[PDB]
A paper describes a structure:
Crystallization of IL-17A and its binding partners was accomplished using two forms of IL-17A. These were, respectively, a presumably more homogeneous form of IL-17A that lacked the disordered N-terminal peptide and a full-length form of the cytokine with a full complement of disulfide bonds. Crystals of the Fab/truncated IL-17A/HAP complex diffracted to 2.2 Å, and the Fab/full length IL-17A/HAP complex diffracted to 3.0 Å. The intact complex can be generated by applying crystallographic 2-fold symmetry. Electron densities for HAP residues Ile1-Asn14 were readily interpretable with the exception of Lys15, which is disordered. Two copies of HAP bind to the N-terminal of the cytokine dimer, also symmetrically, and each HAP molecule also interacts with both IL-17A monomers. The N-terminal 5 residues of HAP, 1IHVTI, form an amphipathic β-strand that inserts between β-strand 4 of one IL-17A monomer and β-strand 0 (the first ordered peptide of IL-17A) of the second monomer.
IL-17A is secreted from activated Th17 cells, and several innate immune T cell types including macrophages, neutrophils, natural killer cells, and dendritic cells. IL-17A signals through a specific cell surface receptor complex which consists of IL-17RA and IL-17RC3. In addition to its physiological role, IL-17A is a key pathogenic factor in inflammatory and autoimmune diseases. We have also determined the complex structure of IL-17A/HAP, which provides the structural basis for HAP’s antagonism to IL-17A signaling.
Numbering used by the authors:
A (entry chain I), F (entry chain I): 1 to 14
B (entry chain L), H (entry chain L): 1 to 9, 11 to 27, 27A, 27B, 28 to 68, 68A, 68B, 69 to 210
C (entry chain H), G (entry chain H): -5 to 52, 52A, 53 to 82, 82A, 82B, 82C, 83 to 100, 100A, ...
D (entry chain A), E (entry chain A): 40 to 129
I (entry chain B), J (entry chain B): 21 to 30
The structure:
C-alpha cells in the first residue's frame, strides 16, 4: 500500500 | 411570557355563523402566527387553522381564521354550522421564547331535542355485604340537557351523608350520562325497609327504589 | 403541506404514578416525516382543564424552551437517530398531574400535529387494584346487569364483557372520585331476559396501573 | 433525512455527484432553485439572493483512478445548502 | 474567507470547536443569531425561523486520545451555516 | 501503526 | 456597509489592440473583501458613450449572465483562490471597443464598487508609435513651446516634460482622430523667456501600445 | 431584457434642487433595486445611491433616491447644488438575468462666468518639412462655454481642406480646451505669404497668424 | 514505509 | 497488518 495525505495532516501527526 | 383570552362559551343554531375571539395581552399579535385547535371529548386536539388562516388538508371551508391588530385579537369563524362542530376550541400563539394556549371556548349547537333520563338502581351485592360493606349504584343515562339533580332517600327520609355523584358527560349518542353512589354500612342497609334514587331533569323527577332482600 | 393527512405519527409512552418529588421520563416515537428538521413540543392538559405548553426544542436540539412553571425541573431532549423526543421530569408536583402530548411544530410555536397523550399522575397515594362486585339482574324482555369496580387508584380502568364478544348494549360509566382519593365506576349491559340461565355474563376488568385483571361472573 | 431544502426561503435541489474513485462515492450537492428568495407572500423576491453554503470536506480517492495499492486523502469543496442574502445589512 | 454569515436574513456566529485529538483540530461551527429571520425592514420576523444546516464530515482522531501508534477515521455532524424556513410552503 | 476505519470504507476498498 | 470607504480594491489588466475576430482575456485582481461571497460584473463604456453591462457571475461561479450582444462570444469566470475575476472575449468586433470595468455586486444587479478600467480596441489597423516634432518658441516674459505627437495608433499617449521635473504650465491637449484612423496630439508648456538658452526643454513621449518612448529637445 | 430612459441634460443654479428621472419599460421597477452613479471626466463611476435610497459612507445628504411605481420610474434628487456636482449621472437596475444602465444624464450648474479663449498657433517644424510634410497647430484653451468655431485662412482666402478639429473638453480649471490642425504639403505652406487660425467664441473672434520663415 | 494494522468499526 | 508507504502533497 501507498497512501498520500496532506502536509497539514503530516504536521499534526508530529 | 403573556396570555390569550377567549370566551368560555359560544352558542348558535345549525346553519348559522359563530365567532371565537382570542385576545393577546403582552406583545403584538400580528408579529406571531395564531393556530386554532378542535378538541372532542376524550380525544387529542386536532388542527383547524394554522398560520392565522391556513387550513390543513381535510378541514372544511366553514372554518376560517382572521387577525385584527386594532384590538390585538385573532378570530375563528364557523359558517354553515353542523352538530359535529360541538367541541372545545383553543387558540395558540407564541413570542420568541414562550408558547401560550388560550383558556378554551366550549361550543354548543342550540336546537337539539330534550331527552328524559333512564335511571337504573342497583342494591349491594352479596359478595360486598360479605366484605362487610354496602354500595347502592344509581346510573343515569340518555338525558339532554346535561343538567341533573340527584337526591337519595331511606324509606321516605332524606340522606346527604355517604353520597358521591359524577358530573354529567357526553355519550356516543350525543346525550348525557351520570352516576351516583350511596356508601352505607350493611347495618344501615339491613335496618331500613327500602332506599330510593330520585333524579330531576328539567323539572320532572324520575325515581327508582330497591329493598333489602 | 409537505405531508398528507395521516402520515405524521406520534406515539408517547412513560406516563404513570409517581410521588411528589419523584422523577419520570416521557418518550415520543415519531414517523412519517424528516424528524431532524422539525421543532418538537410537549403540551399537557390537567383532567377537566385547558391545554398548557410545557416545553420546546429545535430540530437540532441546540435550543430548548420551558414554561416558567417547569423551568429547572424538566429537560426536553431528542435522539434524531432514533426519531424520538424525550421529557425528563424531576421534582414532580401535584400540579404536574396531566395527559402529556407530543407535538410537531412547523416553526417554533406553530404546532401542526399531536400525539395520543400519556397520563402522568403525581400523588402520595399508592396504586390500588379494584374490588369487582357483580350487579345481578332482577325487576320488558330486557334485563340490566353490571359490575361495580370499586376503590381503584389511579385512572384508568378498562371494562369488557365476555372477552370482547359482547359489545352492544354495554355502557361503561365515567368514574367517580371519592373523598378518599380512590375511584369507582360501573359497567352495565342490557341483555335479553330469556338468555339468563343459558348465557354466562362475565365482565373483564383491566387496571393496568396495578397490573390487575379481574373476571367477574354476573349471575341472576 | 432533512426537508429544509423545501421549507427554506432560499430553497434548493440536491444533485448526485457520483464518483466510484472516491469515498464517499455519492455526494449530494445543493443547487439553489432561484436567484432571489421566496418573500412573505410566496413570491420570488429579487431584492435578495439565494446563495450556496460551501464547506471544505476530506475525501479519500483511489489516486491514480481504478488502481488497488495506492490512495490519496484530500480536501474538496461542497455545496451543503442555500441561504438568503440582502444588499442592506441591519 | 466568506461574509455570508453577516449578510444572511438567517445570520450566524462562528464558534471554534478546538480538539487537538482530531484532524482538523479546529472546526468553526455555525450558531444561528436569532430564532426568527431579518425581514425586508431590518427587523427580526418570527413568522419564520433561522435553522442550522448540518453536514456529515469525515475526521481523523488519535483514538485513544494522546496515543501515538493508533488512529480512527470517523464521521461527525457539523453546523455549516443557517437558512430561513417558513411554516407556509409555496 | 493501528488504523480504525468505517465498515463503509472497508466495503469500498473491496 | 460591511466595508469602509476605500478598502475594496479592483485592478483590471489585459486590454489592448486586437483585430476583428480576435481573442483577448481581461483579468481583475481584487482585495479588501471576502471575494468568494460576492457576485462580480463586467461593464464597458465605448469612447464618448454610456455604460453598458457585459456580463455577471455569482460568488461560487456556478451561475453566469451575459448581455445579448456578447452571448456565445464572451465567458466570465473567476478563481476564488486567487481573488481574480476573468473575461475571455472571442470573435471580437469593432462594437466591443471600450474601457472595460470590473465591478463588485452586493446581490446580482446591485453594483457597489468599480475598478480603474482597461482599454480594449478592436480594429484592423496596426499599432503605430508617434513621430515627435518640436514646436519651437517665438513671438510678455512668458514663451509657449511644445511637442506635436503625430500619427499614433491606438490611444493612449502620455506626455511629460524634463522627466517629470516640469509639471506647472504644462497643457497636454486631448487627441484628434484623423480621417486616416491615426491620432495626433499636442503638449505645450509656458516657460519664462529668459530661461531659453539657459534651460533645456525636453518632452518625454510614451506610447505603451507600441512600446515607444521618444524624447524631443525643443529649441528656440 | 428591458431599458431605462433618463433625460440627456439637466440644468440648475447653485443652492437650487435638480431631479433626474429613470423610467423602466419591461418589468415592474419596484421589484428590483435601483442604483445611481456619478461619473467625472476620464474617471471611473462612483456610487451615489444603492438599493433605491441608500447612501455609501461619504456621500452627502444632498443626494437622495426615490422610486415611484405609478410611473415605473426612479429619481435622483440633488438639493443645495454645488459646482462639484457637475458630472454624468447613470441609473442602473436589473431583472432575473439582465443588468441595465440608463443612457446617462449630463449635469450643468448654471451661473459660471464667461471666459475668452487663449489661442496659440504653431507653424510646421524644420524636422517635419525635412520629412516632406507640414502641420499647423492651433491650440484653444481657457474658454467658457465650451462652444467654439474654428475657421482657417491662407493669406486672406478661406480653407476647408486638410482641417481636423477636436470637440471641446473640460480642463482641470473647469474651463474648456480644443485644438485644430491644418495638414498641408510643404509646397502649399512655402507658396503662401501667411496662414491664420480664427476661433469664434460667443460672437467674438480671436485670430492668430504664422508666416513661412 | 510503516506497519499498519487496520480494523473496521460498527 | 499491511505495508503502508505514506507520502505528503503540496
Amino acid at each position: 500500500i501507498h497512501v498520500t495525505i496532506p502536509a497539514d495532516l503530516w504536521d499534526w501527526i508530529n | 411570557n403573556f396570555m390569550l383570552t377567549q370566551p368560555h362559551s359560544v352558542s348558535e343554531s345549525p346553519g348559522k355563523t359563530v365567532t371565537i375571539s382570542c385576545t393577546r395581552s403582552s406583545g403584538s399579535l400580528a408579529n406571531y402566527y395564531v393556530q386554532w385547535y378542535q378538541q372532542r371529548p376524550g380525544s387529542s386536539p386536532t388542527i383547524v387553522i394554522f398560520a392565522n388562516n391556513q387550513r390543513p388538508s381535510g378541514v372544511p371551508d366553514r372554518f376560517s381564521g382572521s387577525i385584527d391588530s386594532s384590538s390585538n385579537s385573532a378570530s375563528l369563524t364557523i359558517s354553515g354550522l353542523k352538530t359535529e362542530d360541538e367541541a372545545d376550541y383553543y387558540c395558540q400563539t407564541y413570542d420568541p421564547y414562550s408558547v401560550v394556549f388560550g383558556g378554551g371556548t366550549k361550543l354548543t349547537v342550540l336546537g337539539q331535542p330534550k331527552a328524559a333520563p333512564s335511571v337504573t338502581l342497583f342494591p349491594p351485592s352479596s359478595e360486598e355485604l360479605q366484605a362487610n360493606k354496602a354500595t347502592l349504584v344509581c346510573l343515569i343515562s340518555d338525558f339532554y340537557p346535561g343538567a341533573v339533580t340527584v337526591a337519595w332517600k331511606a324509606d321516605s327520609s332524606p340522606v346527604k351523608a355517604g353520597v358521591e355523584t359524577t358530573t354529567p358527560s357526553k355519550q356516543s349518542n350525543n346525550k348525557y350520562a351520570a352516576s351516583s353512589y350511596l356508601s352505607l354500612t350493611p347495618e344501615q342497609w339491613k335496618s331500613h325497609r327500602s332506599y330510593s334514587c330520585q333524579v330531576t331533569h328539567e323539572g320532572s323527577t324520575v325515581e327508582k327504589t330497591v329493598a333489602p332482600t | 403541506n409537505l405531508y398528507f393527512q395521516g402520515e405524521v405519527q406520534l406515539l408517547e409512552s412513560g406516563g404513570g404514578l409517581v410521588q411528589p418529588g419523584g422523577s419520570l421520563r416521557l418518550s415520543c416515537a415519531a414517523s412519517g416525516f424528516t424528524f431532524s428538521s422539525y421543532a418538537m413540543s410537549w403540551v399537557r392538559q390537567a383532567p377537566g382543564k385547558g391545554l398548557e405548553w410545557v416545553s420546546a426544542i429545535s430540530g437540532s436540539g441546540g435550543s430548548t424552551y420551558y414554561a416558567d412553571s417547569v423551568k429547572g425541573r424538566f429537560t426536553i431532549s431528542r435522539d434524531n437517530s432514533k426519531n424520538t423526543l424525550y421529557l425528563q421530569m424531576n421534582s414532580l408536583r401535584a400540579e404536574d398531574t396531566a395527559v402529556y402530548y407530543c407535538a410537531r411544530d412547523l416553526i417554533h410555536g406553530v404546532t401542526r400535529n399531536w400525539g395520543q397523550g400519556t397520563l402522568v399522575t403525581v400523588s402520595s397515594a399508592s396504586t390500588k387494584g379494584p374490588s369487582v362486585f357483580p350487579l345481578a339482574p332482577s325487576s320488558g324482555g330486557t334485563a340490566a346487569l353490571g359490575c361495580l369496580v370499586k376503590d381503584y387508584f389511579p385512572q384508568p380502568v378498562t371494562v369488557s364483557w365476555n372477552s370482547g364478544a359482547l359489545t352492544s348494549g354495554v355502557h361503561t360509566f365515567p368514574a367517580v372520585l371519592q373523598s378518599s382519593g380512590l375511584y369507582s365506576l360501573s359497567s352495565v349491559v342490557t341483555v335479553p331476559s330469556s338468555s339468563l340461565g343459558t348465557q354466562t355474563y362475565i365482565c373483564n376488568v383491566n387496571h393496568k396501573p396495578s397490573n390487575t385483571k379481574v373476571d367477574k361472573k354476573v349471575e341472576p | 433525512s432533512s426537508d429544509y431544502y423545501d421549507r427554506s426561503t432560499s430553497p434548493w435541489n440536491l444533485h448526485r455527484n457520483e464518483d466510484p474513485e472516491r469515498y464517499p462515492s455519492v455526494i449530494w450537492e445543493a443547487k439553489c432553485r432561484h436567484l432571489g428568495c421566496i418573500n412573505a407572500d410566496g413570491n420570488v423576491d429579487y431584492h435578495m439572493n439565494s446563495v450556496p453554503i460551501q464547506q471544505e470536506i476530506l475525501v479519500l480517492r483511489r489516486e491514480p483512478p481504478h488502481s488497488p495499492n495506492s490512495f490519496r486523502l484530500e480536501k474538496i469543496l461542497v455545496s451543503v445548502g442555500c441561504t438568503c442574502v440582502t444588499p442592506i445589512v441591519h
